Amino acid sequence: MAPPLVVVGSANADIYVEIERLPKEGETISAKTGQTLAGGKGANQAACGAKLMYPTYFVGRLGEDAHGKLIAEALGDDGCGVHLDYVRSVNNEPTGHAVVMLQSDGQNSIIIVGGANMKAWPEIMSDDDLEIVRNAGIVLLQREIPDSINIQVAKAVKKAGVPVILDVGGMDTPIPNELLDSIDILSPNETELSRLTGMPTETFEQISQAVAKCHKLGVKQVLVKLGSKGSALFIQGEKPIQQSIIPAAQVVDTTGAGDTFTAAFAVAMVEGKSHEECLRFAAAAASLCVQVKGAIPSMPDRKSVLKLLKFS
Template sequence: MHTYDLVVVGSANADLVVRVERRPGAGETVLGSDLATHAGGKGANQAVAAARLGAGTALLARVGRDAHGRLLADSLGEAGVDTSALLTGGAPTGVALITVDPDGNNSIVVAPGANARLTPEDVERAEGLLAAARVVSLQLEIPLDTVAAAVATAARNGTRVVLNPSPPVPLPAEVLAACDPLVVNEHEARFLLDLAGDPAADASSASPEQWAEALLATGPRSVVVTLGAAGAVLADATGAARVASPRVEAVDTTGAGDAFTAALAWRLGLGESLTEAVRLAVRVGAAAVTRPGAQESYPTLDEVAAR
């Protein structure tokens, strides 16, 4: 019996956002808008996005005993996320410094803070939580050894693993082997393929379908490459396919990838095929970019259907 559709193990940050006419170059100063503070972090974003869609969701993360930590706990609770595994202390809450240009594109620098103190021991103590989930979703804004511990715990309990390796780092073979799917954007795909010495890392001579198939050969059970407004490409043992995204006017792309991954993981946990799950995920990601912010931009399932 599964208590949760999705358990997310990952980061929780305060997003400090400034809108700019253009993002600064090296050594350059530009003036921006008033500072806006939002609840964010890839882990918390995924948990909120899934809960908004109707998934039974819990988050294992760590925040500081500070105002940003309270902001995150409140945001998660209001979205319907189970926060019983939200740990506090060890360092200040993580912070993401985000600039957003008029086209909705962003640049992000993350100060991990308490996220860096989420440990394998924390995961071990939460084994019952992971075992009660259909799917465990992970990212890389927490220590890699903690991610590896969560993957091992999920595998031990027969729980499906979805991993977005962001920010990208070299992944242990046992982590890659558990991913079903590995979810990457274009930058992350090229990074991992370059590590593997694969010529498909050269964007000028390889298609996204080739990226996906080349990444599949590195060990994961399935792969999804997100392409922004162009949709996504998926690959598994049956081959590669592309799913188009609906056309929308982008306001802010912050957190859109997290909304995509959350929707994908939820629907896979419900038993949908990878293609079916990606079809919903691209629609959820597209809806998320039409509103500013990360968590506050995430749609309900009814809002997605209305589009």
């Protein structure tokens, strides 16, 4: 009954097919194999939070189709234990999905269908949806749903005094200043930090500088994801702190690990942990995540993260 993690964002069916080579206009080919998996940054972050045994709601839009049931199954009672009260399904849009064509040479080809993620939201968020974010302990957004929705959520949480984190992952359009001005923590990776600031991010000094531009744009806190280099938390009026990776024994699959990092950070934060302990909690979670194939099935339970953290 603690103030919940509330994730508002995307849910996707990820349709992976293993093919020797791409087809041609008319060519029917046969994949070696194929699998369809629950994904999307919003669903991933919600799954992570629920698996960490923190009360978590997902606010998203699905189609009334098989891929929608796939997501609900993965996230809900028989899966991760996300509260799905505020997920709505519609009959005029497909569940969002991605066709991923892994090829016999190492190259990926992807078709992304935004579907319900981009087209099933209302013009104006319902009072019901806004009520769950007002009652949240913390709110997580990404950029795989319309700016309109992110902005309306951001405004409500700001008035309610609820912290909100915006993951920059998703579409590569500019971020509206009204969104930047209404969020507590911006969370880009190195490449995303560069794209929105038009500055280099090859060195930590360059990163600090792009982050300085972020402060000027209205963002008091930036949680920078650095891949193998770990992460860095920048708070205006303070010294940037850093956390290196907690090295994985083996990197099986980095899919979902940035989402795990972000959501785990949010869980540690809302649990009242220090900034240092938040970064380390998140590092530990991302680390367990990359050691296992897949996205949502790779995400660690609280017991495993805490176990890994114990090590000296």
